[PDB]
Design a protein around this ligand. Structure first.
Ligand code: R3Z
Ligand code: MG
Ligand code: MG
Length: 283
């Protein structure tokens, strides 16, 4: 998470956010940040029927989802609802039975998501996690999750604010990332100006007096910067995405044989999923 990036873009780079209806993304592959999507659904097997029904709704609306699951968290995190290892396990299990593709990301899903968008194997990466942009994703989608879908274009953010990726990462770090602390008393809108004018954090600290503006003690901003820039990702060229026919009788055995769901209610969910797979990927 980047503390307050969404509000920043809307204010000083609005030309990057284009608000669209779920219907205009017909026949479109999107990479779905599974951890962030489960976070949404947890608002109890709530995570599983969230993913069951929402994926059907996406598939009926033309969208072809591909979920990407978090792996091992990177060393640096100690600078800053709870998505567990079972939440992930059960969801993966479910998607497997629906014929939806999932991907086990080496580290953080929104980096691997971004990578699919870079390599151009999806249209966009669906997530509210704003640091997916910082991971270099050309297009981010918000609220795919009543509420409009906000499309973010990274080339426009960089174009308006007049910064390359590297500088942009440092802006994000100054806004407040998951990896390190920011410079206290530096507002987000003042952070922009200092990035535009002085380009990088190491420099900004130089033109800042140690008394008035102290940084974190042994501040790992450089390490954060390395992570956002060179993150551990999967190779999308090697990775293959396929949408299979759902295994219905096995899907019952799981949601109803293990997870106390309504059999005929799942039955119809699977039949809509199957029907839309014939609309989306008849092939
Ligand atoms: O997968 C996640 C998850 S799951 C729960 C939280 C996170 N975060 C931290 C931030 C990401 O952005 C957020 C946006 C909205 C609400 C919580 C957020 O939490 C993340 O950065 N990633 O990558
Ligand atoms: Mg993140
Ligand atoms: Mg994530």
């Amino acid at each position: 998470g980047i503390q307050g990036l969404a509000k920043l873009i809307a204010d000083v780079a609005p030309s990057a956010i284009r608000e669209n209806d779920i219907k205009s993304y017909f026949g479109r592959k999107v990479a779905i940040d599974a951890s962030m999507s489960i976070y949404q659904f947890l608002i109890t097997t709530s995570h599983l029927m969230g993913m069951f029904y929402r994926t059907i709704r996406m598939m009926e609306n033309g969208i072809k989802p591909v979920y990407v699951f978090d792996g091992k968290p990177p060393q640096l995190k100690s600078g800053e609802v709870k998505v567990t290892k079972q939440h992930n396990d059960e969801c993966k299990h479910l998607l497997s039975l629906m014929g939806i593709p999932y991907l086990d990301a080496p580290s953080e899903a929104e980096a691997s998501c971004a990578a699919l968008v870079k390599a151009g194997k999806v249209y966009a990466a669906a997530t509210e996690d704003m640091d997916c942009l910082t991971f270099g994703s050309p297009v981010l989608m918000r609220h795919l999750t009543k509420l409009p879908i906000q499309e973010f274009h990274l080339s426009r953010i960089l174009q308006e604010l007049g910064l390359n990726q590297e500088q942009f990462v440092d802006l994000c770090i100054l806004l407040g990332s998951d990896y390190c602390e920011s410079i206290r008393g530096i507002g987000p809108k003042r952070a922009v100006d200092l990035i535009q004018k002085h380009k990088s954090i190491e420099e900004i600290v130089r033109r800042l007096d140690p008394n008035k503006y102290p940084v974190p003690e042994n501040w790992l901003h450089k390490e954060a910067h390395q992570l956002f820039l060179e993150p551990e990702v999967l190779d999308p060229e090697s990775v293959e995405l396929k949408w299979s026919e759902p295994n219905e009788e096995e899907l019952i055995k799981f949601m109803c044989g293990e997870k106390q769901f309504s059999e005929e209610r799942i039955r119809s969910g699977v039949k809509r999923l199957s029907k839309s797979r014939q609309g989306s990927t008849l092939e």
